Scaffold this motif. Sequence first.
Motif, mmCIF file in Angstrom:
data_model
loop_
_atom_site.group_PDB
_atom_site.id
_atom_site.type_symbol
_atom_site.label_atom_id
_atom_site.label_comp_id
_atom_site.label_asym_id
_atom_site.label_seq_id
_atom_site.Cartn_x
_atom_site.Cartn_y
_atom_site.Cartn_z
ATOM 1 N N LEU A 106 42.592 40.494 39.592
ATOM 2 C CA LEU A 106 41.186 40.126 39.478
ATOM 3 C C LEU A 106 40.623 40.572 38.132
ATOM 4 N N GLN A 107 40.994 41.781 37.725
ATOM 5 C CA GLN A 107 40.615 42.299 36.417
ATOM 6 C C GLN A 107 40.994 41.304 35.327
ATOM 7 N N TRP A 108 42.247 40.859 35.342
ATOM 8 C CA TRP A 108 42.724 39.928 34.329
ATOM 9 C C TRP A 108 41.920 38.635 34.334
ATOM 10 N N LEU A 109 41.732 38.052 35.514
ATOM 11 C CA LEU A 109 41.007 36.791 35.611
ATOM 12 C C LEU A 109 39.604 36.910 35.024
ATOM 13 N N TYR A 110 38.903 37.982 35.377
ATOM 14 C CA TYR A 110 37.534 38.158 34.909
ATOM 15 C C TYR A 110 37.436 38.485 33.415
ATOM 16 N N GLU A 111 38.495 39.056 32.852
ATOM 17 C CA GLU A 111 38.506 39.359 31.423
ATOM 18 C C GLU A 111 38.868 38.144 30.573
ATOM 19 N N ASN A 112 39.560 37.177 31.168
ATOM 20 C CA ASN A 112 40.071 36.038 30.406
ATOM 21 C C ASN A 112 39.451 34.681 30.730
ATOM 22 N N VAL A 113 38.733 34.601 31.844
ATOM 23 C CA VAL A 113 38.184 33.335 32.309
ATOM 24 C C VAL A 113 36.728 33.499 32.719
ATOM 25 N N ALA A 114 35.928 32.461 32.489
ATOM 26 C CA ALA A 114 34.509 32.488 32.830
ATOM 27 C C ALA A 114 34.278 32.176 34.309
ATOM 28 N N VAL A 115 34.682 33.101 35.175
ATOM 29 C CA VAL A 115 34.557 32.912 36.618
ATOM 30 C C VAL A 115 33.092 32.845 37.022
ATOM 31 N N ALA A 143 41.136 44.333 45.704
ATOM 32 C CA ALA A 143 40.074 44.378 44.726
ATOM 33 C C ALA A 143 39.584 45.809 44.690
ATOM 34 N N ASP A 144 39.608 46.425 43.511
ATOM 35 C CA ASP A 144 39.085 47.779 43.386
ATOM 36 C C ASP A 144 37.573 47.715 43.205
ATOM 37 N N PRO A 145 36.896 48.874 43.209
ATOM 38 C CA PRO A 145 35.430 48.840 43.141
ATOM 39 C C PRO A 145 34.870 48.020 41.979
ATOM 40 N N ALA A 146 35.448 48.151 40.788
ATOM 41 C CA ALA A 146 34.984 47.380 39.638
ATOM 42 C C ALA A 146 35.203 45.879 39.842
ATOM 43 N N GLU A 147 36.350 45.527 40.415
ATOM 44 C CA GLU A 147 36.677 44.126 40.676
ATOM 45 C C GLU A 147 35.742 43.529 41.720
ATOM 46 N N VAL A 148 35.456 44.298 42.766
ATOM 47 C CA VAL A 148 34.492 43.869 43.778
ATOM 48 C C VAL A 148 33.123 43.623 43.155
ATOM 49 N N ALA A 149 32.686 44.547 42.302
ATOM 50 C CA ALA A 149 31.400 44.405 41.623
ATOM 51 C C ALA A 149 31.361 43.146 40.770
ATOM 52 N N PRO A 178 37.758 44.702 50.977
ATOM 53 C CA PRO A 178 36.568 45.569 50.994
ATOM 54 C C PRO A 178 35.285 44.764 51.226
ATOM 55 N N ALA A 179 35.168 44.167 52.410
ATOM 56 C CA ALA A 179 34.064 43.253 52.700
ATOM 57 C C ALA A 179 32.685 43.914 52.722
ATOM 58 N N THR A 180 32.610 45.143 53.223
ATOM 59 C CA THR A 180 31.337 45.858 53.262
ATOM 60 C C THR A 180 30.776 46.136 51.868
ATOM 61 N N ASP A 181 31.610 46.658 50.978
ATOM 62 C CA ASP A 181 31.179 46.933 49.613
ATOM 63 C C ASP A 181 30.747 45.635 48.942
ATOM 64 N N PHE A 182 31.548 44.596 49.151
ATOM 65 C CA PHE A 182 31.297 43.281 48.582
ATOM 66 C C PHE A 182 29.981 42.692 49.080
ATOM 67 N N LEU A 183 29.799 42.656 50.395
ATOM 68 C CA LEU A 183 28.582 42.105 50.974
ATOM 69 C C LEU A 183 27.356 42.879 50.493
ATOM 70 N N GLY A 226 49.148 44.627 31.810
ATOM 71 C CA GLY A 226 48.436 45.892 31.826
ATOM 72 C C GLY A 226 47.114 45.795 32.568
ATOM 73 N N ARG A 227 46.893 44.670 33.248
ATOM 74 C CA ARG A 227 45.670 44.464 34.019
ATOM 75 C C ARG A 227 45.983 44.142 35.479
ATOM 76 N N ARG A 228 45.047 44.461 36.369
ATOM 77 C CA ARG A 228 45.124 44.014 37.753
ATOM 78 C C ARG A 228 44.801 42.522 37.785
#
Length: 450
Positions: free
Chosen positions: A251-260, A272-278, A303-308, A247-249
Motif C-alpha cells: 500500500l505504501q508503494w502504491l500511494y507513493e507512486n500512483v495518484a490513488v 495495512a499499517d497505521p500510516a497506510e490506513v490513514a 484494521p476496519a475500526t481504525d479505518f472507519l 523497500g516499500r510495503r
Amino acid sequence: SAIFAERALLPEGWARNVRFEISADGVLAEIRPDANADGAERLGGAVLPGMPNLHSHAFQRAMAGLAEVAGNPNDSFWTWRELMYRMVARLSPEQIEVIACQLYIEMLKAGYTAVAEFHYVHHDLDGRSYADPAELSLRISRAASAAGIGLTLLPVLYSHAGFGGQPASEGQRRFINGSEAYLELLQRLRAPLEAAGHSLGLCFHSLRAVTPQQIATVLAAGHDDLPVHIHIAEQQKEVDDCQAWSGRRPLQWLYENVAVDQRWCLVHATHADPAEVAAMARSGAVAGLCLSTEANLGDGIFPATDFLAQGGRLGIGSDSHVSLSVVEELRWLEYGQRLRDRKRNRLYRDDQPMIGRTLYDAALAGGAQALGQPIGSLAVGRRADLLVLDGNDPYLASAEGDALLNRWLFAGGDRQVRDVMVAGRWVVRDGRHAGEERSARAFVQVLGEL
Ligand SMILES: N=C(N)N[C@@H](CCC(=O)O)C(=O)O
Ligand SMILES: [Zn+2]
C-alpha cells in the motif's frame, strides 16, 4: 410501474408507507413516504437498497469448498492457488458461462443486486487469444444479463508472475496481455457492455502481476471515467516480497507512486499499517473487503475500526465464492474485529450506534462507488435495485427500523431475503429465480465434466 412498502430504508433513514414510481427503464422516478398504495404492488416486508458485490471471480464458485483438504502441515493461500490454476486450465468458454450464470442467480437470491467481475480468464486453453479476444468477457456479460444482475466488468491486466516483472508461469497463460492488447480489449468492450446496460472498469491484477510502467501507461491512456481495481496487501508474503523488491510495503508503494483516489477499489488491503490506513482513508478509495474468502484463505483481519474511524470507505465482495451471503460478510466483518479486540460493538459511527445499520450503510456506499454505478441508495434518479425481507418472519415483524437490520444481520440469515429487484425487474420472488431450474441442470452437468 409502482410498488408500495410499509417500511423502507431511504437515504434519510427508515420511512413508512413508501410509494415508489419506477420508470420503464428501471430508474426510481418518484419516492413518496406516508403515501397510499393505490394501484401499486404491496411488498411483503421491509425494503432495503440491494447490496453491491464489489469483487468476484465467477469460475471459482465451481471449486468452492473443494480445497478444504490438508495436503501439507502448513497449507496456505499459495497451495490453494495451484489448485485454482488446475481448474482454470480445463475450463471451456461454455463451462465458464454456465458457472457465471448459476453464480449470479445465487448472488441475487442472497440480496446482491450488482457485481464487479474481476475478470482475468481471457485466452484459450493454449494461452492463445480467441478470434475475438473478448470472447470470455462477452460471455460474462451475457451470463449477467441472463441472471438479471447488475454488472461492472473489470477485465484484468495480468502480465507477470511476480515483482520485478518476472515471466508469467504456464499456469497463468490464459490471463496474459501486454498493456497494448489490454487497452485494445478495454476499449473494444465499451460498446457491447453499454448495449447491455453494463459498466466497465480498469483493473490491475496485483502489484505482483504488473509493472510500474504498465500501471503508468494504462492510467495515462485516457479512460478517466472508469473505476480502478487492484488486489493489494492480501497476504503477508506479498508485503515481504514487495519490501525486498522496492523497500516499500504494498500500500505504501502504491500511494507513493500512483495518484490513488475515489476511483479506486483496493481489494483486501488486509496488511495495512497505521500510516497506510490513514492514507487510504484520506484518499477516498474503497477497501474491497472479502471476509469469507479472506478467512478461508487465512489472509488475516483488516484494521476496519481504525479505518472507519478516519472516514474510510468500504464494501464487500464474495471473491472466491465460498460464501454468497450479505449476512455472512457483514456479520463476520464485525465479528473479526470483535475477536481481535476481544470487545463488542466495534464498527459504528459517531452519529450511528447501531452496528447493523453502520455496516449496511457503509457497504452500500462503498459498493456503489467501487462499481461506478448509480446504485446503493433508494433515491430518485438511481436504479431500482432493492430487496424485500420476510414480513412474516417473527424476528423481523417484531422489530422496527435499525433493530430490524440487527435482527437480520446478527440473528438471521439469507432465507430472510424473499424478493429481489434489479433495474426495476423482479428477478427473485419468494426465494425463487425463474431461470434456476435450467441453470442448475446445466451447472450440475458442468461440475460432472470438471
Ligand atoms: N488472491 C486471491 N484470493 N485470488 C487470486 C489468487 C491468485 C493470485 O492472487 O495470484 C485470484 O483469483 O486471482
Ligand atoms: Zn480476488
